[PDB]
């Protein structure tokens, strides 16, 4: 980037600077490819690992609830309610992916929990208290905290934290991963680097 001098609130300057720099964006993207690809290479693994860990630990908690004698019509969690719980855990991935403190992660994930459990559990058979008990069970499996206390005090559901929350136990590495054919066909280590 921004002009970094003053706000100068004026929409026509915004659109005109955008139209001016459209003749340079189309080449800066082509230049940006060369580090774009490697940063996605070592950034997508965190998403895919946290989504598989959510699937696995949700399956374990639901099966331990079924072994207590409940019916599989009592607890659906099929397509969109799992998508809600993946929304809160992926926002936990984001605020852990920055170098934030514990309670700042806790209250940002509590805000995302408020928005998500407000939106998509009206009209679908699942009260908010059961969903928040499920979220506390999943965090008891991951890091063993159970941080969130909830209420249905108004027409929406509201989530507030009780204790600070640790970041995700997954490190995003700064690697430069090379293929096995490049390892085998090379003649020297410096040919792999250089």
């Amino acid at each position: 980037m921004a002009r970094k001098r003053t706000s100068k609130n004026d929409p026509l300057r915004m659109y005109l600077n955008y139209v001016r720099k459209l003749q340079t964006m189309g080449d800066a993207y082509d230049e940006s490819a060369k580090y774009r690809i490697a940063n996605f290479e070592n950034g997508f693994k965190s998403l895919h690992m946290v989504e598989n860990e959510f699937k696995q630990y949700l399956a374990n908690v639901i099966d331990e609830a079924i072994k207590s004698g409940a019916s599989p019509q009592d607890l659906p969690y099929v397509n969109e309610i799992k998508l809600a719980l993946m929304k809160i855990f992926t926002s936990w991935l984001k605020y852990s992916n920055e170098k934030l403190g514990a309670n700042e992660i806790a209250i940002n994930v509590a805000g995302t929990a408020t928005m998500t459990l407000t939106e998509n559990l009206y009209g679908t058979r699942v009260s908010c208290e059961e969903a928040v008990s499920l979220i506390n069970s999943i965090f008891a499996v991951w890091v063993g905290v159970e941080p969130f206390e909830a209420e249905e005090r108004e027409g929406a559901c509201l989530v507030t934290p009780r204790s600070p929350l640790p970041p995700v136990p997954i490190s995003s590495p700064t690697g430069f991963s090379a293929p096995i054919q490049e390892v085998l066909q090379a003649k020297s280590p410096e040919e792999i680097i250089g």
Binding site: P11, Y15, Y18, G111, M115, Y122, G155, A156
Partner: protein, 131 residues
């Protein structure tokens, strides 16, 4: 399509599509020129309703952005075509969320009573015209 896909398949897609995705961005510039004035419409209809409120109710310089976070999320919920029967719930959801990030509720009750003059922004700017 399924959902469950390995880590290698997505990386293999993103790595091999580089040439086609950049030569599609080169045409998306031409498409962005006429569509980019939704930025102008958006900041016009947001500043015209928030600059007097923020400016005359006494809030500072750098907290204006946190108020913009609230108002901008409300305008997104609006221009995804969602009227009052969801708004009467998302208002108290956003009130609790931005209370939780350190605001004061004596500002929030008046601000949530204020944001009903924000409406939808985005329109279409390319007509077909077969002739």
């Amino acid at each position: 399509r399924r959902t469950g896909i390995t880590t290698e398949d997505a990386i293999t897609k993103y790595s091999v599509k580089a040439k086609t995705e950049q030569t599609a961005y080169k045409n998306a510039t031409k498409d962005m020129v006429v569509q980019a004035q939704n930025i102008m419409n958006f900041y016009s209809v947001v500043n015209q309703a928030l600059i007097p409120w923020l400016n005359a109710h006494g809030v500072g310089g750098n907290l204006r952005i946190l108020y913009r976070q609230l108002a901008n999320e409300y305008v997104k919920v609006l221009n995804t075509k969602q009227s009052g029967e969801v708004i009467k719930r998302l208002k108290i959801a956003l009130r609790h969320k931005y209370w939780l990030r350190g605001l004061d509720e004596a500002m929030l009750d008046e601000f949530m009573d204020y944001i009903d003059s924000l409406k939808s922004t985005t329109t279409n700017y390319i007509i077909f015209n077969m002739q």
